[PDB]
């Protein structure tokens, strides 16, 4: 495994003037349906401005940082015993963990009018009663039972 | 004038055999114009008894080439057609 | 199938072995290998020996068999 991987960049959001939202828009697109997914992300953006008077970017700015975790396990097996090691999440990685958890719980929300499913997800995570926040903190609890394996056979 | 052959080391080497040998006799003949090229792919199976994913694919080309006179006053190229046909060039005449 | 521009179908040698065999009436079965032809109201009530593939089987022609061909009444494959 010679190290090869360079970096490709996508940063385009002219109708709002943002950068995090464009990368979040790519996690919603299925099979290249970009124009469909573009009006749903704005469709769940204006309902927050309908709901809260604050600029809904900052609601999205707050909802990331209550779904984004800090440490997580890593099942590195010693070759004769299956161990798990709580590891520090790299700062570049920890953005995409929240955005990928957020969409997958929006699809099982079970409402009508699809942009209302994602609307309720970004409202809860500014408070903490979301299922993504409950899925965040449970994996946080898995690390301290794992904390004995932090350095030793790790 | 229009020309059809199978390789560009004949048909684009016989236009100079016509452009020089007609402009010498006074009449004005402009520069030849290329056309789009016929391309035909033939994917054939290669094994006698079957093994399907071994294949081989060919391609047959056809080059076209169009001349353009200005003033028709020379029957010189009409006699010099057996000269300008060499091996595989076909010339249909359009004496504009 | 067999659109109404070209309306009927019957075989030529079958027709002379029926239309003349009406004029001397039903005292014999008609042994014929042909199966591509229909039955017709010129033929209501006859006895045809349609080729199975290895033998001939008899056919009791009725009045309500008219549109269907002879192939639906000879067998092909047993499956006992």
């Amino acid at each position: 495994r010679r190290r090869v991987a360079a970096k490709r960049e996508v940063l385009a959001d002219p109708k709002y003037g943002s950068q995090i939202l464009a990368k979040f828009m790519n996690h919603v697109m299925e099979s290249g349906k970009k124009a469909v997914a573009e009006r749903i992300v704005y469709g769940a953006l204006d309902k927050v401005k309908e709901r809260g008077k604050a600029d809904p970017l900052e609601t999205f700015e707050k909802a990331l940082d209550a779904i984004a975790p800090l440490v997580e396990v890593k099942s590195r097996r010693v070759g004769g015993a299956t161990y798990q090691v709580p590891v520090e999440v790299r700062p570049s990685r920890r953005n995409a963990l929240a955005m990928r958890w957020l969409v997958d719980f929006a699809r099982k929300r079970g409402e009508k009018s699809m942009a209302l499913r994602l609307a309720g997800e970004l409202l809860d995570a500014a408070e903490g009663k979301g299922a993504a926040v409950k899925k965040r903190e449970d994996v946080h609890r898995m690390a301290e039972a794992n904390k004995a394996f932090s350095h030793y056979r790790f | 004038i229009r020309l059809k052959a199978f390789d560009h080391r004949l048909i684009d080497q016989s236009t100079q055999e016509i452009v020089e040998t007609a402009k010498r006799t006074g009449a004005q003949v402009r520069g030849p114009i290329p056309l789009p090229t016929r391309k035909e792919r033939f994917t054939v199976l290669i094994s006698p008894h079957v093994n399907k994913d071994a294949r081989d694919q060919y391609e047959i080309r056809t080059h076209k080439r169009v001349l353009d006179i200005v003033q028709p006053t020379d029957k010189t190229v009409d006699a010099l057609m057996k000269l300008d046909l060499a091996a595989g060039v076909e010339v249909q005449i359009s004496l504009g | 199938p067999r659109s109404l521009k070209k309306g009927p179908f019957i075989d030529l040698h079958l027709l002379k072995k029926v239309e003349v065999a009406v004029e001397k009436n039903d005292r014999k079965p008609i042994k014929t290998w042909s199966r591509r032809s229909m039955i017709l109201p010129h033929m209501v009530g006859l006895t045809i020996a349609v080729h199975n593939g290895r033998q001939h089987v008899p056919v009791l022609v009725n009045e309500d068999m008219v549109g269907h061909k002879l192939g639906e009444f000879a067998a092909t494959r047993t499956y006992r």
């Binding site: 385009a12 959001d13 002219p14 109708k15 124009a35 573009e38 | 994917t43 994913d53 294949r55 694919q57 | -």
Partner: protein, 126 residues
Amino acid sequence: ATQNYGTGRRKTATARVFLRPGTGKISINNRGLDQFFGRETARMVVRQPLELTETVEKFDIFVTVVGGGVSGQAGAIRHGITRALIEYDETLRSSLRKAGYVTRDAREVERKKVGLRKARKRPQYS
């Protein structure tokens, strides 16, 4: 004169872009810019090299584009106008080489190969 000819190709498209001094006249194939590109973000992407070089109000723009896809023609204009802006000088050369606008995107589609089904996808075995 002051007429400036600009071409640009991306994803089998081709755009004739003419550029001359005027007042915001943006017309493409005898259509308005908001009318031609129906409901997309690329309505502003054609302005992105223009508003970077602070000349958004100072030119007539006449565009004729052929072939390609919907959002492939919009990229042809963006590459096309950057070649038309650099007929002036090289003052905006460094403003666009650094911007990543001048290089033609070479990424073209790839052919189906035998045995495979897509360009690289292959059927399942067991």
